[PDB]
Design a protein around this nucleic acid. Structure first.
Lengths: 177, 302
DNA sequence: CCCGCGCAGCTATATAAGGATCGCAAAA
DNA sequence: TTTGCGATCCTTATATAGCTGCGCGGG
């Protein structure tokens, strides 16, 4: 192994509260809700612990972002559901699912991206006129990696923690050699 | 399709405006046609169909090492670079193409030759006039040095060449050109000054100062970003030897690495959360407005 | 000459990375 | 003038969703 463990930065999860919601009521009666229907059609709600952001839609569907663990994402999602319930809606906690996970790493050595896009062209996209990182589209596991000249790596597109660790253990010998 | 025929006409007009060789037009027309077969392209906005014209011409140019920049295409097409970015990435992915990278050697020749410093004029005094071949040869050596010393990777390429052209020009007559700034130089050479060109200049001067430290007779002179300029000729004569020697000792790394202050990134503490713990009523009630807060808000919106 | 369909993407949320490019304010 | 610093945008993933642009089929 590399001896390097990628750190989870963000978890995106979803949940169906199983009932239709009046967003005007949520915005008026909650302290932590932000609602500008002309700008964006959902309520933006925030809680302090776990420090996250939820988008609540009039359909009853909800998106939870910003958590650092899959456990924190579930606890935060349940807290938003409990806030909505106390506001007078018959909210349920249905079909909770982790949709995306973002991890980050540092290999602590510089990377010649101009060389990596030649040896691994079938997975690599590097256009420095557009973005400083090399976009690596790994097939197994299906993960997108943003590789920078600094040796710092961003891993995204994972449904489970293991896919982040697997993708990093796969990229490490490619970056070292 | 009326939008396809209009697109193919625009592709041909762009190639003629750019004065591209005759074979390029056909290849770019064929890429636009190949693109139109996909439903994702057919369903796109008329703005995306306008930048698609440019994507197809750029791919053709990239394959023939024609040094066309994405910024130059967007300027000619009066297009947004962000709209061009997303369309180019989509069409490369869609047509499953291995598009070669921009050829820096060819861009140095084209861009450097546009610098109007080869003839004297009221705005270009005699002491500022330089030989085109001496300029190209030294600019190229400074662009290769920037590439070898990690100043090009992940950065826009044109500001690197602007900074290398200015340093080549100054180093060819140091006594009379050191008073001239990068901004004054771009103005008289009649070239736009790219915003990152000042940062690239300073990074390139810092790289030449590290090389100067490898030569005992230059190390003892305690050179600075101003006094190093008259020795650039001597440093480039031995660039291969000095670069190997500089990497061998210590430290020569991408500027974004040296240095980052926040050495520890896992600032959030390790959690013992299970996601199943009880959620008390007091924990939730803090996120609810009181009947008074509600009345005061309602009255304020009435 | 309309209607429906299937895309496209606009608004927005989070997060890491590094670069570009503003505004703004302070030593030169 | 000339610098430095900080804020806000770009990229990736991912769901949520109405409105709307765009062209292809049927009718």
């Amino acid at each position: 192994p590399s001896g390097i463990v990628p750190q989870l930065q963000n978890i995106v999860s979803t949940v169906n509260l199983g009932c239709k919601l009046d967003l005007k009521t949520i915005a008026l009666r909650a302290r932590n809700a932000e609602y500008n229907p002309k700008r964006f059609a959902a309520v933006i709600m925030r809680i302090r612990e776990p420090r996250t952001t939820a988008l609540i839609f009039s359909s009853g569907k909800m998106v939870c972002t910003g958590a650092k663990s899959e456990e924190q994402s579930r606890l935060a999602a349940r807290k938003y559901a409990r806030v909505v319930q106390k506001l007078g809606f018959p909210a349920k906690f249905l079909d909770f699912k982790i949709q995306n996970m973002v991890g980050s790493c540092d290999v602590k050595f510089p990377i010649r991206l101009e060389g990596l896009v030649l040896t691994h062209q079938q997975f690599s996209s590097y256009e420095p006129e557009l973005f400083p990182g090399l976009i690596y589209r790994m097939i197994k596991p299906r993960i997108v990696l943003l590789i920078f000249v600094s040796g710092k790596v961003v891993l995204t597109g994972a449904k489970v923690r293991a896919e982040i660790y697997e993708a990093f253990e796969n990229i490490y010998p490619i970056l070292k050699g | 399709s009326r939008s396809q025929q209009r697109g193919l006409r625009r592709v041909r007009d762009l190639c003629r405006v750019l004065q591209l060789p005759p074979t390029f037009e056909d290849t770019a027309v064929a890429y636009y046609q190949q693109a139109y077969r996909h439903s994702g392209i057919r369903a796109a906005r008329l703005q995306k169909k306008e930048v698609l014209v440019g994507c197809c011409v750029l791919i053709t140019c990239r394959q023939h090492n024609w040094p066309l920049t994405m910024g130059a295409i967007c300027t000619l097409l009066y297009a947004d670079l962000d709209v061009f970015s997303s369309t180019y990435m989509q069409i490369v992915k869609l047509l499953g193409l291995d598009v070669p990278s921009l050829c820096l050697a060819e861009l140095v020749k084209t861009y450097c030759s546009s610098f109007k410093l080869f003839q004297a004029s009221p705005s270009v005094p005699a002491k500022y006039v330089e030989d085109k071949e001496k300029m190209l040869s030294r600019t190229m050596q400074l662009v290769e040095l920037a590439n070898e010393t990690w100043l090009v990777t992940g950065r826009h390429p044109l500001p690197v060449i602007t900074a290398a052209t200015f340093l080549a020009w100054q180093s060819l007559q140091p006594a009379d050109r050191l008073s001239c700034s990068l901004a004054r130089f771009c103005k008289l050479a009649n070239v736009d000054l790219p915003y990152p060109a000042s940062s690239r200049l300073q990074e390139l001067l810092a790289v030449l100062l590290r090389m100067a430290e490898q030569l005992a007779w230059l190390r003892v002179l305690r050179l600075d970003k101003r006094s190093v300029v008259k020795h650039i000729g001597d440093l480039l004569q031995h660039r291969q030897s000095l670069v190997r020697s500089a990497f061998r000792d210590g430290l020569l790394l991408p500027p974004c690495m040296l240095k980052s202050p926040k050495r520890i990134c896992p600032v959030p503490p390790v959690s013992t959360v299970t996601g199943d713990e009880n959620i008390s009523d007091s924990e939730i009630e803090q996120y609810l407005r009181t009947p008074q807060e509600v009345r005061d808000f309602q009255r304020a919106q009435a």
